[PDB]
Amino acid sequence: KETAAAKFERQHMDSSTSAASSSNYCNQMMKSRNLTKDRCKPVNTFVHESLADVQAVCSQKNVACKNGQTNCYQSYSTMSITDCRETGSSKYPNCAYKTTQANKHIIVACEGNPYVPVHFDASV
């Protein structure tokens, strides 16, 4: 089955664009990454950076995750991100999202050897 690291990449990485290019970014990406296939995922963030720059966060500033786990890390630098969250009209299978551009630090949980992101915790 898909590894947690691979699921993080599929759900949260978009190295192919530097920012969201239109209000339809989230609608299209949530669909394309299969985040709407079984239900409308309510919120999701995409990170417009290289994979290595995001994986490097696992050696940056340790901080406890929202859920209390101690394997979370905050990036030293801000990153280009897109916040996706459902619009009021979103209704499966016609999932619909508001796209919001931002430049924020990210917080990720890390596991494994290599020690890499497995969960996107927050933009801050």
Tokens of 54: 């995001």
98 marked ligand binding residue = no
**What domains lie within the chain, and their CATH numbers?**
1-124 (3.10.130.10)
Tokens of 87: 């619009």
- Give me the amino acid identity at 94: N
- Give me the amino acid identity at 50: S
Active-site residue set:
12, 119
CA distance 103 to 124: 9
10 marked ligand binding residue = yes
**φ, ψ dihedrals at 108, nearest 5°:** -130, 155
Closest CA to 72 of 121, 18, 10, 4: 121
Specify the experimental method. Answer: X-ray
CA distance 66 to 27: 26
7 marked ligand binding residue = yes
**φ, ψ dihedrals at 112, nearest 5°:** 100, 180
How many other β-carbons are positioned within 10 Å of the β-carbon of residue 106? 24
- Give me the amino acid identity at 54: V
